[PDB]
Design a protein around this ligand. Structure first.
Ligand SMILES: [Mg+2]
Ligand SMILES: [Mg+2]
Ligand SMILES: [Mg+2]
Length: 801
RNA sequence: UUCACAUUGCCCAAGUUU
RNA sequence: CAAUGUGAG
């Protein structure tokens, strides 16, 4: 439970492919530079950046001589040459167009220590050095553009991109400094997010309430209109010179609205001497709730550069997607255009520190791994061969297909829309596809009844269970999006323990062989079948001893939410294929990534593995989704020990080797085909199986990019895998092949998915817990805990399929 | 609620005188 | 998983 293992070696498996990556090489000088600790009394980050930039111009002659200090926005200051004050304190103060600021100088950043650590000589990558370089690259754009996370956004000049509702698209780019096997690298990627337009509040009202012009509404707002407007502007800032956080939209129109004893229209009529157009419309209530200052819509401006944190509307989203949808070559060229346009070398603050940035994307050589063969059953024992990460189920039967003899249907769609004919049609079509797949639906359903409302579910289901012995499955037709779905799964998964398979009504009226086939995949698994397996003799050597494959993920509540729990999920392989998985799930602290009750969850799974296979795992392979580099030590420290605790409290001296792997699907590394005839499909992406464990990866540690999936649309996200611990001493080859093969064991489709199945199931388990908790989200905890606790008959199934 | 892929929503980060 | 797109035997 200490620092991660070193890179054991480099992969050798697979044919080579020429790739470009959105990493731009950095030439860093071999000099020392100087860290200073600031403290400003009393502020937003951008306000503090402003204090220093004005302060440096003001104490130029006294202190900062021809220097270009960079400032991280709070209390870290860096200079290329030392400041003529030495080792001691200084208390300065600056003017606002009020601030005492303290400058010390704690440290000297060696820099040349970075080159040596990048050479692997020094085991440690010095973080406090990498911190400093990022502050260099961020200093200037942090004031010109509008920061959001590690990115930067600005209004596109020459073009506008409205979304409606007073919003518009702002294009921008992500920026980050990372170390690598080769050099320091600048990772750049284009991005876009919704912003509020800096228009008159009057015109803001118009876009939200759907007026072409002011004069449509001539007398004060409707009850309906004043709340809808209020909901949209409250929390946004506005300007007149001066700043104001909008806090409320008043009840009375300006002319009638009053403050102590004068009225705002009257107040503006003589003090600032302008009658109001639109005296009918109300006033904004600004700043403090306790205080009584009210502002007219007329004189107000929506202040520029405020990110839109509310969820977009559906047509707003449509507009956003349409604007930013981009094939991989188009993506590549846009990154390139931006970077030649950025001209990071001209940046004076960059120039101060003598940093040089490469004009072009780095060239990197990847390898394309071979897909494993997939083994089906029935009589043929057919073998399927993934081609460009895809295969099909025609002319093949499940390795272990379930014979279905007792089953029922429950339609919650209106009969006028979903008729008995449609159901009968759909049934015959399904039975056909299912027999071909080795999953004979041997008879007609023993039950078929229309229903309406979530109220009718539990009684209908309790009936079925009490009546039809050996009942295997209930198929449930739904009219579309409905609360019934959440209800059907609550009763099935948690209350009665009954297999259910829902189908949207539209996919019943009109069915297709592909859709029905994918449906049988889900069904056969839910009823304990094995769809396929990896070709046994084609697996890596690790399968020669008993091994369990764990997948784990946390899912946090949406943006803006304050009290909903985070949900941890852990699944474990239950056979030697590996194919069958059992799941565990927990509610835990709001926005905690660390899986709190992991040890209990792993113990549960280890026991079930033994009852299933009658083997004890000699090794445990742990795939952990979603952890960032910043949280690697904390998570590993807690979660690695939790796995050990599980093993130790199970049996004395039961110490299986642990391999701990973090899976990151969401980062800002993008890989492109250098050679045009390597591109795959309309989107023009790199092929499935593409592997990069050199050049752009970590200088000392064990990590690699693997893109295991076909890229249908946009630009593919190659998944990054990072090994935080490995008792089993894997080689790069074996772990990459293992990880790649597990992307083929995902039962919901005949494709190679973007992450290993165990981790993918961990997502599906979490998301299902989220469905159990809909509108239900010491005594607080136990209620939610029980909401996600599945029935005893469900515990050992793949209900999450 | 057939499914995958892609944009966003998720930990880190970011943000927090009328 | 939700919204929105692109796709499949
Ligand atoms: Mg997660
Ligand atoms: Mg924070
Ligand atoms: Mg969707």
């Amino acid at each position: 439970a200490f620092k991660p293992p070193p890179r054991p070696d480099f992969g050798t498996s697979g044919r080579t492919i020429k790739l470009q990556a959105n990493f731009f090489e950095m030439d860093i000088p071999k000099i020392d530079i100087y860290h200073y600790e600031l403290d400003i009394k009393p502020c937003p980050r951008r306000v503090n950046r402003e204090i220093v930039e004005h302060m440096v111009q003001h104490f130029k002659t006294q202190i900062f001589g021809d220097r270009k200090p960079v400032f991280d926005g709070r209390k870290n200051l860096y200079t290329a040459m030392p400041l003529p004050i030495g080792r001691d304190k200084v208390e300065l103060e600056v003017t606002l167009p009020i601030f005492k600021v303290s400058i010390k100088w704690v440290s000297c950043v060696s820099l040349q220590a970075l080159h040596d650590a990048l050479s692997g000589r020094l085991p440690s990558v010095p973080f406090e050095t990498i911190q400093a370089l990022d502050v260099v690259m961020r200093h200037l754009p942090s004031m010109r553009y509008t920061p959001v996370g590690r990115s930067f956004f600005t209004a596109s000049e020459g073009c506008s991109n409205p979304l409606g509702g007073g919003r518009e698209v702002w294009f921008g780019f992500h920026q980050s400094v990372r170390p690598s096997l080769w050099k320091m690298m600048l990772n750049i990627d284009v991005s876009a997010t919704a912003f509020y337009k800096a228009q008159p509040v009057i015109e803001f009202v118009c876009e939200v309430l759907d007026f072409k012009s002011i004069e449509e509404q001539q007398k004060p707002l409707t009850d309906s209109q004043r709340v809808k407007f209020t909901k949209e502007i409250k929390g946004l800032k506005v300007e007149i010179k001066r700043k104001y956080r909008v806090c409320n939209v008043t009840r009375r129109p300006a002319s009638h609205q009053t403050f102590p004893e004068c009225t705002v229209a009257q107040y503006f009529k003589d003090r600032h001497k302008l009658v109001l157009r639109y005296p009918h419309l109300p006033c904004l209530q600004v700043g403090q709730e306790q205080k009584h200052t009210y502002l007219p819509l007329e004189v107000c401006n929506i202040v520029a550069g405020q990110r839109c944190i509310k969820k977009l509307t559906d047509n707003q989203t449509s507009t956003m997607i349409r604007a930013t949808a981009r094939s991989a070559p188009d993506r590549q060229e846009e990154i390139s255009k931006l970077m030649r346009s950025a001209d990071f070398n001209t940046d004076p603050y960059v120039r101060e520190f003598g940093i040089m940035v490469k004009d072009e994307m780095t060239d990197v050589t990847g390898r394309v791994l071979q897909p494993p063969s997939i083994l089906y059953g029935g009589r043929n024992k057919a073998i399927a061969t993934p081609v460009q990460g895809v295969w099909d189920m025609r002319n093949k039967q499940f390795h272990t297909g379930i014979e279905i003899k007792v089953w029922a249907i429950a339609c919650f769609a209106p009969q006028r829309q979903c008729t008995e004919v449609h159901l009968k049609s759909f049934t015959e079509q399904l039975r056909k596809i299912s027999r071909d797949a080795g999953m004979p639906i041997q008879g007609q359903p023993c039950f078929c009844k229309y229903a309406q409302g979530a109220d009718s579910v539990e009684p209908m289901f309790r009936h079925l269970k009490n009546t039809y012995a050996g009942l295997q499955l209930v198929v449930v037709i739904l009219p579309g999006k409905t609360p019934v779905y959440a209800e059907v799964k609550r009763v099935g998964d948690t209350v009665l323990g009954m297999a259910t398979q829902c189908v949207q009504m539209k996919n019943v009226q009109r069915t297709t062989p592909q859709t029905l086939s994918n449906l049988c995949l889900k069904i056969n698994v839910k009823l304990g079948g094995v769809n396929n397996i990896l070709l046994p003799q084609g697996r890596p050597p690790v399968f020669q001893q008993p091994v369990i494959f764990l997948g784990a993920d946390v899912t946090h509540p949406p943006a803006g939410d304050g009290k909903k729990p985070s949900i941890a999920a852990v699944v474990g392989s239950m056979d030697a294929h590996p194919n069958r998985y059992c799941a565990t799930v927990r509610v835990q602290q709001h926005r905690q990534e660390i899986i709190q009750d992991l040890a209990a969850m792993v113990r549960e799974l280890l026991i079930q593995f033994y009852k299933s296979t009658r083997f004890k795992p000699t090794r445990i392979i742990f795939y952990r989704d979603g952890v960032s580099e910043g949280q690697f030590q904390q998570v590993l420290h807690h979660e690695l020990l939790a796995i050990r605790e599980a093993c130790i409290k199970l049996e004395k001296d039961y110490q299986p080797g642990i391999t701990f792997i973090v899976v990151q699907k969401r980062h800002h590394t993008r890989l492109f085909c250098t050679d045009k005839n390597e591109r795959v499909g309309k989107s023009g992406n790199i092929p499935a199986g593409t592997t990069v464990d050199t050049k752009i990866t970590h200088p000392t540690e064990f990590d690699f990019y693997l893109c295991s999936h076909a890229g249908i649309q946009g630009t593919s996200r190659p998944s990054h895998y990072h090994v935080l611990w490995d008792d089993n001493r894997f080689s790069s080859d074996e772990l990459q092949i293992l990880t790649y093969q597990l992307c083929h064991t995902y039962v919901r489709c005949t494709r190679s998915v973007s992450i290993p199945a165990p981790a993918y199931y961990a997502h599906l388990v979490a998301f299902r817990a989220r469905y159990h908790l809909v509108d239900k989200e010491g005594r607080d905890h136990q209620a939610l805990a029980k909401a996600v606790q599945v029935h005893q008959d469900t515990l050992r199934t793949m209900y999450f399929a």
